Amino acid sequence: NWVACGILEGGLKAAGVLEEGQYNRELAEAIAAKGEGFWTTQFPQIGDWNEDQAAALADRAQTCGLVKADT
């Protein structure tokens, strides 16, 4: 619903990953970049988790109509 999607929108804006006219792929990339840190650099599995969760979150953002579908 709009409330859940709005909370998601606000949070992503506040985290500095969501912007205007952004495609799903771009949002996912921005989230993964902000998720990088000591653990993603040291362990492949953590780096993969970061990318997979980022993609999943961007997907939820798209469903919430916050980003454009990849074409």
Ligand SMILES: C[As](C)(=O)[O-]
């Ligand atoms: C794995 As994707 C960026 O098509 O949701």
Ligand SMILES: C[As](C)(=O)[O-]
């Ligand atoms: C299901 As999709 C539009 O995130 O590849």
Ligand SMILES: C[As](C)(=O)[O-]
């Ligand atoms: C159209 As919008 C989700 O960038 O306010």
Ligand SMILES: [Zn+2]
């Ligand atoms: Zn907006």
Ligand SMILES: [Zn+2]
């Ligand atoms: Zn806008």
Ligand SMILES: [Zn+2]
């Ligand atoms: Zn790119």
Ligand SMILES: [Zn+2]
């Ligand atoms: Zn990467």
Ligand SMILES: [Zn+2]
């Ligand atoms: Zn391991």
Ligand SMILES: [Zn+2]
């Ligand atoms: Zn997806």
